[PDB]
Write a protein that binds this ligand. Structure first.
Ligand SMILES: Cc1cc2nc3c(=O)[nH]c(=O)nc-3n(C[C@H](O)[C@H](O)[C@H](O)COP(=O)(O)OP(=O)(O)OC[C@H]3O[C@@H](n4cnc5c(N)ncnc54)[C@H](O)[C@@H]3O)c2cc1C
Ligand SMILES: CC(C)CC(=O)C(=O)O
Ligand SMILES: [Mn+2]
Length: 454
């Protein structure tokens, strides 16, 4: 970056909001993944959408790559500046607006996290359910297509994003469903909102998200259930889903993960475990609990260990599983897998994954959203090239096994830098070309987060 170009950026956002300092660039050059690249050439903090547009236009027309940056909690290298350029940190736009409690909807800017929104909504009787473990930007969650523990009942970001405000790569402003619009369903034209959910910053910059809100449950019960084997826990999960029990949360931890979480938080029996949560009235809960206990008992599950204080720490421990695993070997980093398969194939692939972790000399823990047919294998790495190549090979083989079972290589984390070859295998040549044609019409010069997804 030329001094002329830096001065032009400063003319848009203000001198304090542009930095070319190495330490600041390095802090914005990575996420929570093990990937690393040269850092961006500058970091810029726009203060409003007009500034986002003008920064994008300046970069685009000068041939400078743009890297959108929310809270930097992604795990696939989405913010890594593989071709340099300008990192646009969006978190100074942090306002909640257009709260429509009667319509179950709200508009948030990129600096708003789920915790901030739900704190704003205290006493409204409403909440936002999609819950990554990290304190992530809600617009970043829209960009990655995030889900979480509550998605089995309340949906993913794709289910709960009603509208998006997007600055396109050349600076034009798009409201994907129309400015100010919010509604339960539409057949009007092509659905542009779904195209930008899960686009990971490669099609434009999300500067606001319109979110579906949900009623707070009448009553809540959480519990844990320990099992003799991974097979028994995952068989119970599949049978709970096939019985159509509307569980609010159903999270699997293997024995390694449960021990890690105990040590980093809980004193649950070290065994493959389900964390469960149920929502309803006193009267629906009793029914759901009886039917779910009947199924878990059939598969060797323990009596439910029941859990505001204790369920809050139960789910905080789950949400920090990433850090619990890293803490097993301080100094390590980690890669996470994220496959999602048809639920009837989930027992095969989890049990196979457990066996393969046992047979390898990698250290790995298993956790995740099995109600969705989804799970994470957390593989620790010495930041040891041969161990790194074994971890990459393990993750590729697990991805390809998921694809062989009719599934997908990522249920929620995205593609970033790590899964680009798996995506090509997953959708094939016509799928790849079609995605690339979409990328090219919105980003002709290829400057919108280059090197990611495709
Ligand atoms: C402990 C922990 C637990 C997690 N649990 C989950 C989980 O349960 N489910 C899940 O889905 N993820 C989970 N994540 C991953 C991560 O939190 C999500 O992917 C989240 O959506 C990333 O948001 P972010 O703003 O931090 O992303 P960043 O890392 O800042 O960016 C991620 C990608 O999105 C792009 N991007 C970010 N903001 C925008 C924007 N406003 N407009 C356009 N593109 C943008 C970036 O360019 C990049 O490609 C977890 C992460 C951690 C560390
Ligand atoms: C921490 C992530 C790598 C795994 C995840 O998404 C989760 O904890 O559910
Ligand atoms: Mn997850």
């Amino acid at each position: 970056l030329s001094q002329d170009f830096v001065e032009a950026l400063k003319a848009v956002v203000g001198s304090p909001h542009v930095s070319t300092a190495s330490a600041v660039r390095e802090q914005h050059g990575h996420d929570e993944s093990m990937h690393r690249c040269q850092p961006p050439d500058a970091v810029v903090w726009p203060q409003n959408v007009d500034q986002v547009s003008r920064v994008a236009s300046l970069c685009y027309n000068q041939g400078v790559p743009i890297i959108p940056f929310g809270t930097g909690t992604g795990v696939e290298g989405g913010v890594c500046a593989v071709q340099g350029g300008v990192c646009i940190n969006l978190t100074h736009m942090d306002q909640i607006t257009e709260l429509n409690t009667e319509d179950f909807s709200v508009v948030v800017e990129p600096g708003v996290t789920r915790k901030a929104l739900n704190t704003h909504l205290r006493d409204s009787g409403l909440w936002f359910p999609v819950d990554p473990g990290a304190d992530a930007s809600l617009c970043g969650m829209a960009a990655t297509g995030a889900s979480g523990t509550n998605a089995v009942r309340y949906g993913t970001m794709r289910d709960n994003v009603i509208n998006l405000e997007v600055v396109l790569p050349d600076g034009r402003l798009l409201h994907t469903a129309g400015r100010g619009r919010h509604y339960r369903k539409s057949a009007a034209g092509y659905n542009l909102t779904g195209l930008f959910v899960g686009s990971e910053g490669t099609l434009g910059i999300i500067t606001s998200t319109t979110l579906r809100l949900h009623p707070a449950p009448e009553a809540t019960v959480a519990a844990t259930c320990a099992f003799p084997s991974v097979q028994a826990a995952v068989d119970s999960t599949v049978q709970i889903l096939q019985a159509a029990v509307p569980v609010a949360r159903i999270e699997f931890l293997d024995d390694v993960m449960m021990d890690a979480c105990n040590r980093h938080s809980l004193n649950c029996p070290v065994a493959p475990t389900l964390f469960l949560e149920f929502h309803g009235s006193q009267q629906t809960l009793a029914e759901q609990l009886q039917r779910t206990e009947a199924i878990t008992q059939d598969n060797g599950g323990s009596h439910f260990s029941w859990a505001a204080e204790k369920r809050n720490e139960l789910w905080a421990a789950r949400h920090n599983a990433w850090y619990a695993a890293l803490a097993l070997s301080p100094g390590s980093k980690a890669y996470s897998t994220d496959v999602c398969v048809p639920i009837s194939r989930l027992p095969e692939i989890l049990v196979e994954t457990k066996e393969e972790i046992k047979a390898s000399k990698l250290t790995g823990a298993i956790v995740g959203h099995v109600g969705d047919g989804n799970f994470h294998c957390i593989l620790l790495v010495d930041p040891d090239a041969e161990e790194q190549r074994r971890v990459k090979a393990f993750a590729e083989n697990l991805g390809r096994r998921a694809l062989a079972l009719g599934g997908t290589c990522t249920g929620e984390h995205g593609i970033g830098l790590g899964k680009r070859q798996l995506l090509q295998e997953e959708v094939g040549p016509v799928g790849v070309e079609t995605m690339r044609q979409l990328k090219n019409t919105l980003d002709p010069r290829g400057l919108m987060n280059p090197g990611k997804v495709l």
